[PDB]
């Protein structure tokens with residue numbers, strides 16, 4: 001549909017009848033506008049104390065992330081895990097509560113197009129438990145760019161259990177904003193991403209946040225072909241089948257190729 005879908009080689013799988021059917025993807029974000037004609041929301045939960053409806057997206061972020069998951073894996077069961085309020089901010093407890101729900105509710109893929117500058121024993125415990133429980137955990141690397149020689153990969157992206165996603169444009173160039181470090185795993189399209197917006201709209205957003213869902217959608221396609229495959233196997237296939245770009249500090253393993261990873 002959008003250029004980023006074709007770029008990751010998703011359409012080849014779609015033509016084959018692999019569209020992410022029976023894959024439960026949790027969008028741990030600002031909610032999802034379930035009212036959008038182009039989105040099918042299966043369930044979810046809100047963990048934002050003042051915004052009790054997960055199906056009301058007061059930000060726009062979670063609907064845009066969800067629509068990218070949907071563009072990659074059209075048949076995937078989308079779950080709106082509302083952890084971020086109208087301002088796009090959320091407390092760590094709300095976020096961790098949303099991961100805890102995703103595990104509890106047998107989500108196959110977690111998408112976290114979110115990041116914080118600091119970790120916690122509780123955040124690491126939550127991601128680790130998800131992984132140990134066979135969930136594919138995908139997160140945005142962060143929008144911190146370059147910072148001397150140091151990692152600018154945010155949390156939870158920083159944790160070895162999480163697939164940390166960096167952003168490339170349509171040319172396969174690293175976006176100037178894309179966080180860097182040894183914890184960067186893969187690259188996906190993350191510059192001027194056309195996706196669904198609340199109130200039957202479409203618009204572009206840029207960020208590693210936009211790159212993350214292409215991988216979460218990519219993990220849904222793999223699981224649709226290979227329902228038997230472990231989260232470990234899904235991850236290894238995505239990482240081992242990449243189009244090799246530059247240095248792993250900047251590009252991770254390179255750009256994901258869903259066609260090559262699906263075998």
Ligand SMILES: [K+]
Pocket residue numbers: 157158159160161162163164183184185
């Ligand atoms: K990581």
